[model samples]
Target: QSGQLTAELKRVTRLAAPMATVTIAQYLLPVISVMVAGHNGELQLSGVALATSFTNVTGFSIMYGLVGALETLCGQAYGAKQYEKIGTYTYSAIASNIPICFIISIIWFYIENILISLGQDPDISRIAGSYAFWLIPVLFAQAIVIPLTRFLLTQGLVLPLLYTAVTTLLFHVFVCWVFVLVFVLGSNGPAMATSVSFWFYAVILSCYVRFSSSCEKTRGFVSEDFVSCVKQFFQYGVPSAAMICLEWWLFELLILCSGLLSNPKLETSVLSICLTTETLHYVISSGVAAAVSTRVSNNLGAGNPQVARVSVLAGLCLWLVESAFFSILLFTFRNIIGYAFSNSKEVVDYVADLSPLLCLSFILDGFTAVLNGVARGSGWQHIGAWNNIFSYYLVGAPVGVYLAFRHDLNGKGLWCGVVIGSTVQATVLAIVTASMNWKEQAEKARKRIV
Candidate 1:
């Protein structure tokens, strides 16, 4: 019986692992598409980069909080076979999410003015503003789709989401290319392409859930329970959002402070390149994170704490192994990787110089990334949030700022802060996971399961 249980646990974790990777790829592809296209010129490059990051900073804050709640709710509901509640929870989650998106949109509309007044370049802000205008309204589609995807995830229907996302990825690339290249829409073109891609992705995903027999066992929506679900969603979501906000702001601060140092342009430019590359690897780590969350949640919902624990371990192990592989790959080909992204000799040399630290930092980051999944699985969103606040905000950002200004370490100082923050986060996650009371978590999840 124990052997069988172990096998079952491995099977579930295996199922979840690939899906997590796909989720990361799905999220990363659109951003990468924009980045690749922006490489055509400095104006286009800076405009799109700043615009995408701005929208992301705002929209993702809401999305992460909502989606985190959705994962927990849907995973538990699906585990208990409470099919109707799934739809209701999803609808309520989306409904609540819509108002939040609207509020953010309005806030962003005005905030763009502030950024402009602060002497942000007009050309970039104008394009970013227009892009945000289009983006904010369509966010409801994501609010709707993401929860449903979580529903599918709970049912072990991981592969379909991955396949659909691959299709969406292809569409994003193709449309972005056509609109930017053939239609000559420039920076705005990529935004339009992404907007269209989001709609398509939402529709395609919705269609799968609606028509597939696999989802017939999961159906509940447009009900009175939605109000409670909404409340609970927000309760679980807010902290996650705050955590992300704090994290993003720290990096943004790093970039801002880097500009105050000598050779501000070169410093900021190199920092951007390093950060961007770091994000690419993060995409892979994020995939692992998502998968672990889904798998662990499912197992916990099934009342199998051991399975949940094992899934977390599997995710952590996978990330460590992958990070090691990447460390070697990056270290061995640092020059090639640097030159591939930019033609500038200075940028190339800087990146090559920075590669060793960057690689080590990312590997350490992988631990926190997986731990985040484990924390989400254990219904410890608040703990995860506090960990980031303490590590990134209190320790990482401040120390890095001082070093950059006082010691003149420039971008390296900022990166050193990142390493410190990530290391702290990883350490905290280790403690949280080690002491996690999975049985208690399972009971708590039961309250939300319905």
Candidate 2:
């Protein structure tokens, strides 16, 4: 039993390392953009960072979240060797993805007008507005590529993602060089380069799936099966977006409301720094969660309940060790590390005080991220969104409000609420995970793949 456990643990690690690497590379596209643009000036950063944060919260959170539905269907079908079914699922995924993108683009195109009316800075709004407009193509590029990337992922072929993402980013960095410095496209350059990179990835991967031997078996389209996929995708996708928007909005809302707090400037600066730091840590946990989803879905679909369940244990261990390592690192460096995000001593001390609480959020959120992966891997629409609603919105938001406003806890109290919410999420997910009847789940997967 112990030997088999180690064997399965290695399986998880195999997928995880590549998955995280791809994620980091894909994530770096914008960083490449940001770096090119930031070199222009410090004031320009306000607009660049502002626009980046806004787009992520309002648009891509849902873009990224909805694609997780594929992890459930795509992984299981590949596991069942139901290759024909997965091709149809992806078409519907791309189809389901495209329509909403238009809506976001519409909003983004009008962002300057709306932001100006809201009384924000004209130049900052101008920058975000232009950045978002040009970035529209980038959004649709992801629309196609997210599902396409997942096509490889569900099949446990991380190499395709690995080579393609790095290739694109390297290409992207060069284009960013041309657009920003050579052509002087200003704020639009980074986003335009980003668009070029995503489309390159899109076309390259599409070619891989369409004609390559790798996807030949799993790449056929099924017209009749597609009708049902349209239905199923929305059902899962809606809730997945719901879960993301609720949590995503909570963090952004904290930043907005931070500006109205007692020490508005200090609180907003410190809170923004903390939120950004926590977001960086989140990607690490999500990387592991993605790997867990792959193993759990594939094993469950293959009817190996014991192996699938062992994958869950492996994921927990992986994330636990990682979150702990980061937690301790941050605590040890808290006073010193504040200089990384800010220059002021006041900001530094504020960070020192909150590092422990942040570590708690990291610890609890890491567990939930892994558990949430388990849910998505197993089809979580029924369970996942409701837990997000119950935990973050109902329990977490109110706690933040009461502590920060009623008790004068300020930003610290708001994060205290974040931890409390993460704690609830982790417990509920643990209970749900521990209590599942895995064999029955295998049958459900068998039925769902068709």
Candidate 3:
């Protein structure tokens, strides 16, 4: 019961609790959209689901991932007392994220044709395309919103981020109800709601950054710092994005593989439902990860490697408790939780059967998630990115395809593959942080920020 570790644990909880809430509210915006749209009809449900998956894989995930660099840049900069550089890095990330959005926008605009080419249902593809086109604004909105999020999070300013997310989510729910129900805009209504809500988020957070005295030191622009910050932003951002996209794309691949299974529709529905539920739970781990990353980077930048090392331990402790609670809850309710996602006896039962595997995912994903945060804070995104490539791509993927196809285990086999992938990623991450040289990490942070 060392006082230092106990103190670090409290600090993590203080930040992790709010960050978790903020991430949940933010992620629920889109999940809520899907829920609103799903109730319209089977076709509307399929179309919206397809659009959600497509847009996320191609657009939102990349943006969110790339902005992870800010957790390092602005975080360590804040710790190093390079206040102005935080703003510079935020601007740099926004600059970089936007152009990529443009590329993704064009792809979204042509999504129907792309889907059709990929052999998707024409009717579903058409609806999905319209849904994606409307979501274009959200992409741009996040280009600004996400970096501002990290700008605040890295500085230990979770209150504004939490406040803004709650406000935006409440607003989003109202608009989604109005557009989808009162106006009867059909499937497009939720997409439109997501767009307006995201813009609302952007506007409010921007106002906060502009006027808040707390941000005065971190909000200034340095024209000269722009070019240098961009260079450094990408240095960290590419791996950050890769760290995200490589692993996430595996889930996408899971859905793709499921559709080819014996009962295509049944498998797809079960797997997608599981994916949604996992994401719902994943938001909590994300908050913990962010808190520790910011804490670690901040301490390391300030040459407090002892504190940085303790931050990792605290995050793991939190994960231990968090994972056990959720895993037991999910396991206890394995049968009924599927009914929350579907109506059919077969689908529900299938999900129930899969629930045990999902509990494994919940634990494994939480473990890797925290360690991944440590990697970002430690400024070694390259290692994490490569770890994912090795674990998910090289090893876990083949195991999954082999079990699911070669052994005919179907959806169960596919999920087991993903879990195995997660196991590998988490083990490597845990090993990396456990054995890290604290003094050297502090030096690295100082060098990266100074």
Candidate 4:
């Protein structure tokens, strides 16, 4: 083909290949969380999953938005060899998250009471509230750790992140077991465990930054453009966070709407199980997405758009392979999958009936999720935010609501809408990335990095 076509092909391969390695390594924790927590009984499992979504919206908004901006800031800075701004930007990003974390924590802590006051069922609100309260403090750890990890990722030090995650996962599991088994913390136990683990994780990463020559050289608690640096962090990060939050909130709404449907108990239980399963797929996809974001941003920062393209391609390839594997596992052992989450035969059967369709969406989501990550890598946060709004609210919710009520499709119908929204979302991201000019993109990143 043409010279441009050749360059694009090369770019796609370069960026995507390394991303595959890092993404796969990062997926283990989520996979483990699913297996460990899946069979804990329906209500408990549902409570944890639901509470997680709530807690995450606030935490991830801070984490992803700030970190996304940080990656751009550092990537560009490193590209231009502006070492001091790197440290200043990095610390400012972390420091900025501190207040946001507390704000989110307080919100989650009182969320259940707030919902109850708004007329939600007392029992439902009570259970959800207790779980959410325990999760609130954990935001502090994420506030620091998430941005710190992104700093490493921008430097192309994927293995450090991998090690940190593995260590944190181990620590988290141990603490969770202690809280749940020894202290009888019940639903709150896991949340507490996660909270403590996050602090530890943050400390470990911070230590690495303190000790490493490269980290010190590239970052610090000070900078000349400190005020502008802070603004840049929020400017890029908020839109990025908003894009992710908009999509995730749709799923939260799924849970809420399920609670309102006829046969609330059975429907809620079924939807919860399906959501748990969906979460497993999401965890895997998220790992890859993180890698995609890092790789794309780094490549683009270095003025290598072709490399960014390769990273996207590689991420999708790995996503497809992993999705196919998960599909087989879910399809062949649908019965067994339920035992991992809960022992209820009724819940298992309900989930099994819908597993085939849900799994299809899961597989497709793998592709779409990675594309979304890739888009974020290219610093298209605002565009992504708009896409999420259109797809999830304008399209996904309306379609699903109509199907849920008008056609009697129930939770299954709503999921179909989820699949449709994600499909459209992925397509939009793909179009945006495909149409991009790598050279120009690289120059923009260069301007921002230092």
RMSD of each: 2.6, 1.9, 1.8, 4.1
lDDT of 3 by residue, 355-446 (tens): 98898999998999899999899899999999999999998989998999989888888888888888888889878888899999889889
Residue-by-residue lDDT tens digits, candidate 4, 280-305: 67777776776677667767876777
Judged by TM-score, which candidate is best?
3
What lDDT score goes with residue 242 in model 4?
83
Candidate-wise lDDT, in order = 0.75, 0.86, 0.90, 0.72
Give the CA lDDT, 0 to 100, for residue 230 in model 4.
87
> Total clashing residue pairs per candidate?
7, 0, 0, 18
Give a tens-digit lDDT track for model 2, residues 84-152: 888989889998888889888888887788878988789888987888888899889988899898899
Backbone clashes in model 3, listed as residue pairs: none
* Stretches of model 4 off by over 4 angstroms after superposition: 1-53, 59-61, 79-83, 121-134, 183-189, 332-353
Arranged by TM-score, best first: 3, 2, 1, 4
Instruction: For candidate 4, report its TM-score.
Output: 0.83
Which regions of candidate 2 deviate over 4 angstroms? 39-50, 121-123
- Angstrom error at residue 235, model 4: 1.1
lDDT of 3: 0.90
**Which is superior by TM-score, 1 or 4?**
1
lDDT tens digits by residue: candidate 1, 183-237: 9775667767777877888899888888888887676585668788888788777
